[PDB]
């Protein structure tokens, strides 16, 4: 995409979402990074929307072919499902070098700095979802020290009803249960988290309000399943 | 379970 | 896919469909196809699912950013357009070619020659959607006379019962409404497919009752709106 | 209106 003015790669990325054309959708965000200049907080999202449908997408269809490989325990299944897999793994691998090169090294505010090690958390936590042995340790581990630094820059810099903030603790949570067999650090994260923004929604007007407890909602549904 | 849905803008 | 093995190619279509896996599917039964034997019947509706998903998916992109195209009347809008039209015009051609080199010259049934006949029209259909001016027209007739050619064998080899023939009749209706500006024709062609079919029905078993009923109800769908 | 859905085999 170097050939396309910046601001018409946001546009079409725009385009591509309201046509759900993820695919093209990354590609055009992946080209506006390349750019090298720094993300607009709602830049951040659309890169942020059009990966997680691409790599959503694809770890659906791993799931399926997983399934069937474990049921079926010729080549065929294991192949495509491997096809698949490094499918997954590449879009993982460009996300995380778009985050490398320069994404986190350049922000510097601490809503910015927080929502790409959030993503940073996410992909490397995809790429473990798939992930077997002792190559699984390191990539985990990855995922946790990412998630880490943003949680305690968040707890720091942020309100505990803070949409990125709540997300990130969220998705850590998840990190615990799914990935590091940690049900119980899962559950007391959510939780506290939970609590946290509760007692902060006085302070916020009726759209902040929403969106906090949306993803409190969530929080909550995990907790059920939990418990 | 579920992580943050965030698959529109 | 010409190093894979025609059965796995096959296996691999309907692993890609039940992971939805649409793109997949595809390129594996345009492999199939291109090995030179002749698809069974299983196999053709894995051809034909494959490839309406991806056009289909291409078509509703290609809906949204027309819309949008149309009510600002930069250029973006309009690249974008093009760019998913030019894909879409890929694929028919992709689908068109696969019929003429050599689907339809080898099929003498009628169930697969009226089937790839459907699809011909089908596909130059989708071609005349996208088209303008004096392009569109030979596309239209294109569209029109595959559908007529597999009209007029399936009203001599086929019961007006049989699914494909049902398909083929709402599809060339839907052509006549929509593509031709002949909502009359539509609507008797419609019409008389129904009664026809219905008067059919006694001979059939339960289960062919039920595939032929469901046609009958989108032809019916299709009456309620026209009338 | 409505052609053959067809997503699905
Ligand atoms: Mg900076
Ligand atoms: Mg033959």
């Given at each position: 995409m170097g050939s396309m003015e910046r601001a018409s790669l946001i546009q079409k990325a725009?385009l591509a ?7 093209d959708?990354?590609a055009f965000m992946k080209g506006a990074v390349e750019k090298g200049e ?190 | ?9």
């Open positions: 725009k979402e309201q046509a759900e054309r993820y695919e959708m990354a720094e993300l607009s907080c709602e830049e951040r999202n659309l890169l942020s929307v059009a990966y997680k449908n691409v790599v959503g997408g694809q770890r659906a269809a791993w799931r399926v072919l997983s399934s069937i490989e474990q049921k079926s325990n010729g080549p065929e299944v294991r192949e495509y499902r491997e096809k698949v897999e490094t499918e997954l793994q590449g879009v993982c691998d460009t996300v995380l070098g778009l985050l490398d090169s320069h994404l986190i090294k350049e922000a510097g505010d601490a809503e910015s700095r927080v929502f790409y090690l959030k993503m940073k958390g996410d992909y490397y936590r995809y790429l473990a979802e798939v992930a077997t042995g002792d190559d699984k340790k390191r990539i985990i581990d990855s995922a946790r020290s990412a998630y880490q630094e943003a949680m305690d820059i968040s707890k720091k810099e942020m309100p505990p009803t803070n949409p990125i903030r709540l997300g990130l603790a969220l998705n850590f949570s998840v990190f615990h249960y799914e990935i590091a067999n940690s049900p119980e650090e899962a559950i007391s994260l959510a939780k506290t988290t939970f609590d946290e923004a509760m007692a902060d929604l006085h302070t916020l007007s009726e759209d902040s309000y929403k969106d906090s407890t949306l993803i409190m909602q969530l929080l909550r549904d995990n907790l059920t399943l939990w418990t | 379970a579920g992580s943050i849905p965030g698959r529109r803008s």
